[model samples]
Target: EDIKVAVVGAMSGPVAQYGDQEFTGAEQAVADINAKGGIKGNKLQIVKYDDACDPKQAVAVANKVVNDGIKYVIGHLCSSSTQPASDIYEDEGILMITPAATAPELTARGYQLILRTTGLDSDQGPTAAKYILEKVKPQRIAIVHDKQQYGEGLARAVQDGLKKGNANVVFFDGITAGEKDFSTLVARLKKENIDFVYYGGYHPEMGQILRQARAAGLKTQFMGPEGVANVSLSNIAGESAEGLLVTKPKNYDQVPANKPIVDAIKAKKQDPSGAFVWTTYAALQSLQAGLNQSDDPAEIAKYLKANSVDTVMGPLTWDEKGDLKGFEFGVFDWHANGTATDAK
Candidate 1:
């Protein structure tokens, strides 16, 4: 028997970079597993689709996966894409694990078929807010979002967390994605004496905003969620991205247990740079583990819910809600070297 897993996401679009990493890593994992004689004599096959970061497209992909009898799915990156597609998977009784979608509401809906290897917006938002308050302590902070569920929701969470820490949030605003001109917003921040600005959005807008803000001489430090922390952000923002702050999962390389996996990736002539590589690798391995335990999706779900699996990301255990058990966040500073350095 061969196990087929559906991989759906923005394989080609403005956000293709993120999806590319995810799908590539997943393909690599499947290939590696098959090379080792597979799980219980069953090889893994990946059926992939490009959602283009569109929600409706994601639903279509989900329907196709279910119709094709795929028992498991490994994608739909954006929160917007993941939410609608989740219901489809749940209704069809397929196990769906997301490697990048970070909306808190996705897992909170109490769907047995959905699980996330990444931290939610709720986890990332508070962590970033607390870090800024304790370390930077800027007098006037501005909060901005891309106005999507993932961005706006994370901004609200960060705002709540900032209030809890007694940090002054001066402004909260939304910017349209892919906007070429942000001079007006930059002017507002410059005039308002904003010391720190946290933007809840992906690298596309964050990179442009940072570059524009710097070009306009607004020297306020910018911070954001995992979406803004990718290496591509450095390329987009160039020298202007230096010193920007972003929050993400803990460093996989620093985790002692992940050394062997890290070594394996290096041996295969690959760069273990993105978080998705490790997380998706873990998701694939977890699916294999669950399937090995039982063919029933419900029993596999139960096994995953109750057990901890050592992954490339660390010890991963899920609660009944399919949320990872522990909270681990990392703060990184965008250095001049085109790489983000973990802030001490």
Candidate 2:
């Protein structure tokens, strides 16, 4: 007998690459766990669902997983989608562990069966604000977002911190997610003389705005959330991609304790440096650890909440709300060379 686990996310859409990044590590983890005598004597089988990073689609996928009778879930990558999908999972008694979704609300709603491997926007938002206040120290800051749940929510968190820190925020606005042109927005920023811009969204729109702002002779420093940390950002923004700062999860791939696993992943020709890759791998390990203690979902949830989980990201412990305890975001310098170096 095999345990069927649904890996739901944006399998097809503008942000489908994020799902691919997750699968790369998750598939490898499932294989490795199965080879090591499986999780509690049963092999794990993955059933994928494409939510397209849409809330409506994510709700449907959650329903489909329930219909498929899958008790274990590993997705709904984006925070907006994850919130809705996990609502269904929570009611249906399914065990869900999101490796990518970062919105604080996912774990804030008192869902007993819900857990996540990544830190919250509350973590990264303040981290970005701290860097802006201490390191960048610009005169005027512009906070922009894609107007979606994840992006706007993250922007608000950063905005809150910046306001409390007494920073001069000249502009706070939203841009349509899929729109390609940002010339007018750039013009507005230039008019406001904004010296630093913080974008709370994914790479596609961030890259577009960065490139367009540069083309319009808008000279300002750009910073963004982890969603903008991708090699494709450089491809989209060209030379303008250089010197962009981004708040990201810790670079676990470079951690000495993770080198062996990183080497194994690299041996299979899959890159392990993606934002969600290590966390996705850790999600499976966490599930396996919980299952090893008991098969009852409630009991497993209890065990996970009470115990430390050893994973690729290191020893992780979840609070009563199923959010990882003490997980943090770090600042990295994104370069035109398609690489990011941590400011550690």
Candidate 3:
């Protein structure tokens, strides 16, 4: 009824979890805000688009958002998608914020129209790598990725940190994202006898690799980035997903230190466990606060870049580079039933 913000990302693909997680938070935000009154007397409305996590698809959605007369945008969830889509938004002067895209290369490009609600891959990648080195203490760890910008970038960050810690990287490689089988990787992991595998990709591919490696007798512990924070791992890999390790945005709702906003979401009967749920909800809340103070996109972005807002993540503020600061950066344990507990 009011502002038409486009939510663009993977609604139906291997990384569809991105779209689902973002929408849940945004949807809840819109509902709660509209219930009491509205944003500056205008009701909030969200339009959805599916990029399927592809760069080309993201560009297509960007064009569609512009042509459809929409102004505000909330995603392009993967860094691969975010990079291209941000180009379009910047050129068109649209206000955009990403809830979960973590590639530091994104903010490095200096897009004034772009802001992100989550910490960078530069944060979690090294955190995960250090965890594997110091905590898991694997003598030989192998890092793998799907080769997309987000996955590859996170993988490289993990690799760099592992090298700095003097952990032996017995294996490193990339796999086609949607490839149904990972027998090749499984065979190689078996031969190398890697003590740990760090996959910088989404759940589907990681789940497949886990299954294939299990069938091939590779029993090493598996690790991954925040992208793997979905129930689909267990759905795809069954018991093989148990004991899996992952690093992603810390669940603010799970931490007592960050309890209020999460308590609000849970009281509404919506699950708050999705990777971006709290962050995306926080994005909307902060965006709303910024927009209410000033409708100008540049002014809103300027204010956002310098101010702190109350979020489930708490006192959220962006660095000059437009990335969130002080959010937890680390790995988590994937239990047999698909829940993540702190690995630290």
Candidate 4:
């Protein structure tokens, strides 16, 4: 177990679920591989670090990993956190494969070793927004954003895409994060007669807005970014989440052959509904596959561009931009009754 991989993420902040899923997914992948024989007779070991979803903390953890002689990483979850730490990894030549960060500029910066398993917001925003516009065909739309770097940026991308698609965004506003009550916003949704809401925020606020809007008798169907694509939405929004629509990276639960990994999570009392679990597993599996071919990150990345692997989400590949080749984003209907699916 000497070949240690540093698994860094927001292990103890608002977005801890992202980190937790990475850890859970990486652990499962490691166990499964080790249970068999391990890659090249070497068991992969993951050393954990808490970045708290902060850029400074991510760098600190990166330094810690380097000091401990670990070269590969599977984290730095948020785009904000991932970017800053990635600079250090690039400079130091430590290979990285983030399981969850999705900002487009992350890979656009030319880090030969750092690649993401998920799609970029540039791709996700337009894909989700355009699909929602065509599918929902809302007479009038309301765009709600959290105003942070990730949220507002994604909201703008979605807005731009919607306008291009000839959809009307009747209301555009930002909601303060950590706001406990969304009654006022809910009233506005009712007043504006917003048929569809595109919320660009984390699950916490997205859930509350949906729940409060429901309580006010406003039948506003919501479409949100990947941030709200977790089961925690159902926990927060309750029955209001019945028809809550969300766009996310593809889900492994949709693939029948993925039952083993899905069941392993449930067996350990961990919810594998978040696509991060599957993507993170794919990252590790990709690393394992690449290692079978070559040891260098650049070579592994090149091998990935031309090769395909049977991941939980089906065969996964990447383009020259280091983004997933064909399968990147998928729109899921959140029934809250089961894992989100294309048809509920």
Indicate which candidate wins on lDDT.
Answer: 2
| Model 3 alpha-carbon miss at residue 166, Å | 2.2
Please report, in order, the local distance difference test score of every candidate based on alpha carbons: 0.84, 0.89, 0.82, 0.81
Model 1 weakest 10-residue run by lDDT? 335-344
Poorest 10 consecutive residues of model 3 by lDDT? 257-266
Candidates sorted on TM-score, descending: 2, 1, 3, 4
TM-score of every candidate relative to the true structure: 0.95, 0.97, 0.94, 0.93
- Local accuracy of candidate 1 as per-residue lDDT tens digits, 228-330: 7777888788898888998887666557876766677778776667777767888888888888898777788899998988777767899999888885778
lDDT tens digits, residues 1-344, model 4?
A: 34677888878877777777788888899899888888788888878899988778888888888788777888878887888888888888788888788888888876687777777888878887878767778898989898776788789999999888888889799989778798888888878888888888788888888788888899878888788878777778888888877778766765778888889988999877777888888888888888788777678878877888766666787777677777567787887663577833
lDDT of 3 by residue, 194-239 (tens): 8788898888898888888877777798888877767777788888
Cα misplacement distance, residue 81 of candidate 3 (Å): 0.6
Candidate 2 residues lying further than 4 Å off, grouped into runs, are none
TM-score, cand. 3: 0.94
Model 3: colliding residue pairs: none
Question: Stretches of candidate 1 above 4 Å error?
Answer: 253-270
Q: How badly does each model clash, as a count of residue pairs? A: 0, 0, 0, 0
**How well does candidate 3 match the true structure, expressed as C-alpha RMSD?**
2.1
RMSD of each: 1.8, 1.3, 2.1, 2.0
Cα TM-score of candidate 4: 0.93
